[PDB]
Design an enzyme around this catalytic site. Structure first.
Site: not given
Ligand SMILES: O=P(O)(O)OC[C@H]1O[C@@](O)(CO)[C@@H](O)[C@@H]1O
Ligand SMILES: O=P(O)(O)OC[C@H]1O[C@@](O)(CO)[C@@H](O)[C@@H]1O
Ligand SMILES: O=P(O)(O)OC[C@H]1O[C@@](O)(CO)[C@@H](O)[C@@H]1O
Ligand SMILES: O=P(O)(O)OC[C@H]1O[C@@](O)(CO)[C@@H](O)[C@@H]1O
Ligand SMILES: O=P(O)(O)OC[C@H]1O[C@](O)(CO)[C@@H](O)[C@@H]1O
Ligand SMILES: O=P(O)(O)OC[C@H]1O[C@](O)(CO)[C@@H](O)[C@@H]1O
Ligand SMILES: O=P(O)(O)OC[C@H]1O[C@](O)(CO)[C@@H](O)[C@@H]1O
Ligand SMILES: O=P(O)(O)OC[C@H]1O[C@](O)(CO)[C@@H](O)[C@@H]1O
Ligand SMILES: [Zn+2]
Ligand SMILES: [Zn+2]
Ligand SMILES: [Zn+2]
Ligand SMILES: [Zn+2]
Ligand SMILES: [Zn+2]
Ligand SMILES: [Zn+2]
Ligand SMILES: [Zn+2]
Ligand SMILES: [Zn+2]
Ligand SMILES: [Zn+2]
Ligand SMILES: [Zn+2]
Ligand SMILES: [Zn+2]
Ligand SMILES: [Zn+2]
Lengths: 332, 332, 332, 332
Positions: A63, A92-93, A115
């Site tokens: 992403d 996720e980051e 987020l």
């Protein structure tokens, strides 16, 4: 005026009173609440603060990172560490798991999506924060393996929804409760107790733009929602585009949400650790179901902190109907 | 810190400086801004304030009235009257037009939807307020007829979006600008100047649950968005369910939004005076298009303050493509 | 909920309805309200924002400038210009008058103290913003002379008080009204209508640290407040240290406030243009009195935009008592 | 943006990390913070909410009860009980001690003044909340006697100040720290670490309206502050009228605050349990002094939960100077 405000802190402390815990779960949730309020405030004025736009990077799942992903990720990472309740963190980051420094170590492993709903940020549509909490099982030094637990092992999971109002939905062993953020005093107040999803809904939620890639089972189900074989009224369609928003509507309105595997994506798009598992847990505690179409999401033993998984969740009768179709098409 | 804050008030006053008006448009917009902030604050804490649920009534269009419809309607009606800038008011929530008492009369006619997106209130999904402003044309005593003007006669139109952030989108003769509410000082600050929609988008928005009732043209278009004849990537799907949210995303992301006429609804569902016309105006000023499939929305001369109208709007190339299909199917 | 909110804007528009003005007074006050809300928000979180401390400069009156003086001054200057209602501006923080550029010129001259109560900022005690508005009298090009009008020529005056709550006290030809800032919607709402001060109070307010420099009249009066000759109860003492706070308490509780001329300061300390005159106007419209001890503050014709003036104000019976003492001591 | 916010919760948790406590002090302070934010929000809009005025009752100390006293008292009582950290509670507003029900009992005894500065509420001058926390000493059933401990036994004390900004001043065994409320996220953030008071100030604070009742020592000291025997500059005077405000200014600016015993009040006015002791503790931890004029406030063994006590506190050199005067006048 208030005078007897029923906060998430009080609520959590009270229920777990006669369970005589270490009390760090409360510390953990209190910490998460601080970050959630900070994220909410920032989101509520993102345009004025120039927080829209890319950060200039790509995460392991591919992403394109946004400024708000960074802000929210840092916020969550910092508060969780300071809580003295965590040891391993998965985001996720972050490419790899984050091992909490010895001095601030707690017994919990927290998987989170700082987020959720990236594509909906710039258009002011609902976005959120998703989390799942596990107790460190092993006796070994804390490591990424501690996050590789099946969702059925969760002791807590939920999400923050930055919608028309900010809500904190929390699920634990005995059920689900909703807490709404009171902007004036910065406190999450209980608003919905022991939330239970309808046995059968009347809304289906999926991105029909992938119709050319859908498997026959998803295709049949959708057709069935539009042209009921028994001539009942067709289901209404809703697809906000942010997992947190679609799942939340599913929870309180009933119905079904789908992000299946398609011809180009064997494991779908959504991530198991910080997207699928938490929502799956919330759904089950609300009396709903959550499947990949072939197995229960919570039973999947992950091998990759960033692995993906198909997900179909919501009202038990709706999910079961789709599972029957999958089984009808099941080819050896 | 701010020190040179660019508000909607300043912005509006400045542009219309060398047009030497009476200044009541500013009075009107300032008034509307007060109600919008009040609605936003209430919405942001609706659960804690017990504002969710029905009011116990049905409006002329047959919608079940909600507590927030009443609160927002009263708020808008009161501020507009106090503005000394209006004479005739039309609201989705009022059977008949509201004639402003002589003493507080202004030259403007305001059509508005106090709270758009009814079905999405309880699930915390984006909702809003839509308005369209006309100059009283006649010399007669102010009456409901003064609201029966075609949208091409609008001098101002826009909407409030209570999403992850609260935005006030304002369109006038020369263009569209976005203003975001700064919660700390209760001021709408300019964030997007002269907004223009993409010539062609990659997102289609419609409730596919009505597929059994769609006319062949809508059916063909959707099929084309999923299975591109030229093998380009299929459009993504998005349908929040609240007109204001879907239209806003359309504006800033491009693409197309549809609420067509179907086999059971000759004129679609959305109301022309306070839903279709305002959005149609915003779209055109942004370089977009807005049609019923056979004629331009803004050219329709209304005969009923509550009449409905089909609506297809967004990126010019997308809308035109669908119009070509409608014409291809046009049967005498 | 509100639904019929009575704001300063509405209130001001309504009263001046049948006076058919240009409407710029409303524009002026609306503008000032925006700056006041910005100042309030900043003040409410000054420590977290690092806004405490000196700016590194000295104003004409010799005060060491603070960061908040700069922030508030810029804020006020910018909004007033953008209002299209002013031509000449006088601020405690600007050496010379500020002539508004031709294009944004209005008919008003505004004298203001961006941040009153400097010594009380760091200790979180009440501070405020004071203003006085005049109509440009001359036909000449706007200049500093336009600000050299006696306070009796004011058409509006008042102050913002950043206390336990933020209040906007506004006085005009017919009286005084108090408006309290509603933090949630950023609107000043009417809370006290037609405020009138008690004929006689029971609180005296002055800095008794200057007792060695007090003239015999002030000395006699204070002694009289502590040891009543008629054996009535002695007055209570109150001295916050910020003019705005002490004057406001005087207004709503009654009594007397004093910052007299002493042996080392012939004209006292407070500035006539932006401190004494505005408060003097508020007092008179509330039925109070305001004197230097020898003449009415509002009758002084200023020769210096930054000149100082002694001031004694409050309940008429209290002020008169002190004036009698001054006259008793009056030496030719 | 923040991202690494240093809250009172984190700060308190961190320092007491290697002291391995039960963690209930944190629970206690977190609870108190919730009530403080609620009180602040209410105070900030008291006029609009109609919270000004009497409640229609008198407390044991004879004060006329205000609506805000009731609101704040209930708020504090409720959160403390829910904290599971207290057993005995003493409030200025409750005739007798409040014994916490067995099920919610904690080891702490909390003495508090829900709303300090009664006379200053209606004029918007600074007000606050004062508290002192003790560990239950006895093994007996919790009772009012548990609150009858000398201030030197406090383990924590402080106050909330609802001034231009809301501050939470917290003192514990090792020192004093200031935390300012961030209205946007409802969190108290550290702003001043290890606060220490000046050895000598230049401001004296007392109600000189009681000059006719002052003992010779107070009289001599005041005269000395106005007419320095060594010809140094006289001290400036400041008396807000709310204990919390005057004490806070004393803490950060230095100097002295006095509410002595007079000819009509042997024990002064301020209450020892919830006014004098907490402030005395804060002062000492900041390197200041706090006396009645004859003995240290913290050494007084109370016999009445509502007993009064004279108090002189602030900069050590200032307090000592006054003590020397008291001793000079000491008559056997
Ligand atoms: O206080 P501790 O030791 O952190 O754990 C207790 C918690 O376990 C649970 O999360 C289990 O679902 C809650 O029931 C409870 O708050
Ligand atoms: O000030 P008045 O007289 O109300 O009208 C002026 C207004 O007309 C418009 O709404 C036309 O689009 C604006 O350009 C402008 O603010
Ligand atoms: O609208 P204009 O032309 O600016 O002036 C009107 C104003 O004059 C006053 O300030 C006089 O005290 C108000 O009565 C009124 O709002
Ligand atoms: O965590 P517990 O058991 O409540 O007690 C620890 C506390 O004692 C103190 O209040 C002593 O001043 C703090 O140092 C500390 O937070
Ligand atoms: O655009 P798509 O492919 O429909 O993806 C939507 C999904 O993307 C996500 O933002 C995850 O990247 C989810 O919140 C959401 O459900
Ligand atoms: O449920 P449906 O029929 O798709 O209707 C959605 C429409 O309903 C509305 O709430 C109007 O009633 C619009 O905001 C929205 O676009
Ligand atoms: O410290 P002093 O001399 O008593 O001055 C107090 C005065 O100073 C001011 O801050 C002006 O400089 C006024 O607000 C206030 O009344
Ligand atoms: O009016 P007085 O007698 O000077 O009392 C002031 C004192 O009253 C109190 O409100 C207590 O009743 C304290 O906050 C304050 O210091
Ligand atoms: Zn992502
Ligand atoms: Zn996500
Ligand atoms: Zn994400
Ligand atoms: Zn409706
Ligand atoms: Zn609508
Ligand atoms: Zn509506
Ligand atoms: Zn100054
Ligand atoms: Zn000043
Ligand atoms: Zn100043
Ligand atoms: Zn009291
Ligand atoms: Zn008190
Ligand atoms: Zn009190």
């Amino acid at each position: 005026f208030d005078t007897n405000i029923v906060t998430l802190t009080r609520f959590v402390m009270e229920e777990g009173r006669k369970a005589r815990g270490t009390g760090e779960m409360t510390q953990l949730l209190n910490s998460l609440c601080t970050a959630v309020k900070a994220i909410s405030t920032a989101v509520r004025k993102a345009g004025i603060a120039h927080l829209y736009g890319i950060a200039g990077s790509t995460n392991v799942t591919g992403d394109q990172v946004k400024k708000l992903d960074v802000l929210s990720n840092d916020l969550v990472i910092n508060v969780l560490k300071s809580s003295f309740a965590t040891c391993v963190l998965v985001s996720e980051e972050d490419k790899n798991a984050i091992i909490v420094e010895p001095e601030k170590r707690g017994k919990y492993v927290v998987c989170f999506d700082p987020l959720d709903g990236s594509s909906n940020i710039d258009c002011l549509v609902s976005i959120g924060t998703i989390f799942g909490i596990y107790r460190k099982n092993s006796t070994d030094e804390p490591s990424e393996k501690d996050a590789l637990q099946p969702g059925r092992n969760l002791v807590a999971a939920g999400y923050a929804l930055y919608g028309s109002a900010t809500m904190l939905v929390l699920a634990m062993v005995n059920g689900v409760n909703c807490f709404m953020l009171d902007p004036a005093i910065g406190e999450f107040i209980l608003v919905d107790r022991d939330v239970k999803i309808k046995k059968k809904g009347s809304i289906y939620s999926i991105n029909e733009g992938y119709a050319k890639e859908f498997d026959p089972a998803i295709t049949e189900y959708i057709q069935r929602k539009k042209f009921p074989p028994d001539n009942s009224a067709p289901y209404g369609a809703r697809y906000v585009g942010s997992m947190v928003a679609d799942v939340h509507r599913t929870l309180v309105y009933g119905g079904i949400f789908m992000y299946p595997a398609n011809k180009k994506s064997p494991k779908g798009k959504l991530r198991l650790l910080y997207e699928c598992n938490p929502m799956a847990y919330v759904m089950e505690k609300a009396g709903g179901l959550a499947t990949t179409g072939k197995e229960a999401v919570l039973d999947i033993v992950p091998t990759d902190i960033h692995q993906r998984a198909p997900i179909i969740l919501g009202s038990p009768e709706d999910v079961t109907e789709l599972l029957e179709i999958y089984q009808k098409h099941a080819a050896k």
